[PDB]
Design a binder for this molecule. Structure first.
Ligand SMILES: Cc1ncc(COP(=O)(O)O)c(CN)c1O
Ligand SMILES: Cc1ncc(COP(=O)(O)O)c(CN)c1O
Lengths: 408, 408
């Protein structure tokens, strides 16, 4: 089976270019030509059809800085989906705000717009929709709600680089878009993050937030070898969340084939959708008409335990991995909801305000039915598998079909 | 003149090893052999003679996590020197605590122990001494004060990798040591950070704080290809501050020659100390008897404006750079004190608690005479210059000597 990550001599070439420039950080001085960071930023901005792009250290930090740039802090509430990686919620706690969970839709696993209004209070300042696995949150409904209630929208696109909703790439629709480039993502450098926005003011603030209150110099063409490209601004307090040049170089390389590989993943995902949907008891995810291009970080399908011998997703996956010989990293059940995830334990850290970290019972006692049911009756196939030949993917289909015949 | 950073085919070899392992992140699965992160951690721990080492994303984040691990948060005060990079103070604000500045010593530019007591209040929980440029803070005095007042000590070693005080490497003396591996530092991968501690409990907490509440599995030798090396713990809430494998690889390479290069820098620094000290009006930094090995991230010497035509450090440096033909990055005046640095502007961010960010007047109105005088009558030579041949360094000495004769 295809493995992940993937590299080529082109990747090595980009790394060699960093060594030749002898500039390993954006805070390093100008050595003659543009930094890998800015070259990648320009390329990704074009890819996303978004005015501004600022690379950073991780998707988690990308989310945090997005919140900081919007002026979110103590006393504020931010609405987030219960089903997602814990970072979507911890980024909120990191800025002293309170994450407020809302359940997801049964057929997309993305935040349910019809449950958002009920969670809005006078403290609500933003919503962080997540385009989970291989689906997009309903940005039409979400932006309508955000507009009516004067709320900001931050798109968590860590699992949807390149997805398109009504001809707008994921991340360009909300006020600020955040991406992760951690190893498992479709665009990766091992570690890495990306922030994008259409607003010029936010672009300046984001730069400062990740470069110790600094911004790019007025004109890079006027720079001489030895001159600093980052200059003081001081409009907003920032810290160091600069991506290394080695990572920006790898991202530049990986980006050149992102659209093509996403196209392959989608072709195969659709193939699976039509094949798996014919099996009684299997339900594929519902694709919104507004989505013209879907990036599949993870291919998800659901099953009815009643029609599959009462198996839970863990057992279902174990059976499939044995039959297909693929690793746990590549075929497994979805995350546990954030409020139930052992990795989510805000109350254990004094750094968090007592008013927002609450107590163990406060979070664990929350109830979000749809999100909770997900890890028990859904199967997630990592995108690398979607790069395999159709003949190979057919084996997965046959496996699910066999298992089904075993209970029919 | 020698430039920085510096690499070799050994550096390229380490990078190729990461590509061969196809594991680019510590959160990636086991691919057969130990991660670059753990190999570097083990090597650096041996280098520092410290029990535990956890690599992270930056020196700024290293400081922040050190504070989080010690339980520092809202309502706490942390004593820091006025003369240092702004991160020493912003890391404190990042955990919702209040940084409290103390002036530095005239002949070392490190926090003045005799001024620390006066700053201690019932809210004080820790002290963050910084081993600035080419000097070490008096750890004897600081640990005595910390012991008497029940305070934690976090050593900011971003500018002193390898320094030795009473046969203990910088960072191993306090409760937790933090290091930066940003491009300009003596040990670098473009971006990067390191945390070290002697305490087993803190080691576990630090791991979780940088890996989303996870720790290393019980035994890596029992791991099969495909298995995750990071496992859930949940004793303390963490976020993602994992160093990429590419960076850990470069650090492993750079570490192998760190001690030798530091030895060269020190030999040359001493040469300069004996030569420059003979010039009327020039004062070298005072080296504590307890320091047996001094890492010179920056070589600093002071001058008496009264004996040097009233020149300020900026003009003095401009003259020297013209005569020696070296860049501003390599020869320049010290930082402005943190409270006066335009990059330090806590009041501009809502993320910070109103109680700790205060106002512009609160910080800018502070007064720390020694730290303030530093940027006006001190010259800093970047460590790369200290790797030059003695004959070349003599040119610097001749330049200062010429300038002196011009005012005599
Ligand atoms: C929705 C979401 N947000 C944020 C993150 C964090 O990304 P990172 O591990 O690069 O800090 C992830 C997982 N990578 C995620 O799935
Ligand atoms: C004392 C000190 N602390 C922390 C830092 C921050 O280091 P970093 O740029 O790797 O986040 C620096 C400068 N690198 C520093 O001099």
């Amino acid at each position: 089976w295809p493995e992940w990550p993937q590299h080529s001599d082109r990747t090595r070439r980009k790394i060699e270019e960093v060594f030749q420039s002898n500039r390993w950080a954006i805070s390093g001085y100008w050595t003659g030509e543009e930094s890998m960071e800015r070259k990648f930023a320009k390329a990704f901005a074009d890819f996303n059809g978004v005015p501004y792009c600022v690379p950073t250290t991780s998707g988690s930090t990308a989310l945090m800085l997005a919140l900081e740039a919007l002026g979110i802090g103590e006393g504020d509430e931010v609405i987030v989906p219960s089903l997602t990686w814990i970072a979507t919620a911890t980024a909120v706690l990191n800025v002293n705000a309170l994450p407020v969970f809302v359940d997801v839709e049964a057929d997309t696993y993305c935040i349910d717009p019809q449950l958002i209004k009920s969670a809005i209070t006078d403290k609500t300042k933003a919503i962080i929709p997540v385009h989970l696995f291989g689906s997009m949150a309903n940005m039409d409904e979400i932006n309508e709600i955000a507009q009516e209630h004067n709320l900001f929208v931050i798109e968590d696109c860590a699992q949807s680089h390149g997805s398109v909703w009504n001809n707008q790439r994921a991340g360009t629709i909300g006020d600020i878009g955040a991406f992760s480039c951690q190893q498992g993502k479709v665009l990766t450098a091992g570690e890495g993050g990306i922030i994008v926005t259409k607003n010029p003011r936010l672009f300046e603030l984001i730069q400062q937030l990740r470069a110790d209150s600094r911004v790019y110099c007025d004109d890079s063409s006027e720079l001489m070898h030895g001159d600093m490209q980052l200059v003081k601004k001081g409009d907003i307090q920032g810290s160091n969340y600069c991506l290394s040049e080695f990572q920006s170089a790898i991202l530049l390389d990986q980006l050149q084939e992102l659209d093509d590989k996403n196209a392959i993943r989608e072709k195969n995902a659709m193939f699976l959708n039509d094949a798996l949907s014919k099996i009684d008891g299997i339900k594929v995810m519902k694709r919104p008409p507004q989505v013209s291009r879907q990036t599949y970080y993870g291919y998800v399908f659901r099953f009815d335990p009643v029609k599959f011998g009462g198996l839970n997703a863990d057992q279902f996956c174990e059976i499939l991995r044995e039959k297909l010989n693929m690793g746990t990293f590549y075929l497994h059940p979805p995350y546990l909801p954030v409020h139930k995830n052992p990795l989510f334990c805000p109350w254990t850290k004094n750094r968090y305000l007592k008013s927002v970290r609450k107590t163990e019972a406060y979070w664990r006692g929350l109830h979000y039915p749809v999100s909770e049911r997900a890890s028990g009756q859904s199967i997630v196939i990592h995108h690398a598998i979607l790069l395999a030949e159709p003949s190979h993917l057919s084996l997965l289909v046959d496996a699910v079909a066999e298992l089904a015949r075993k209970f029919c």
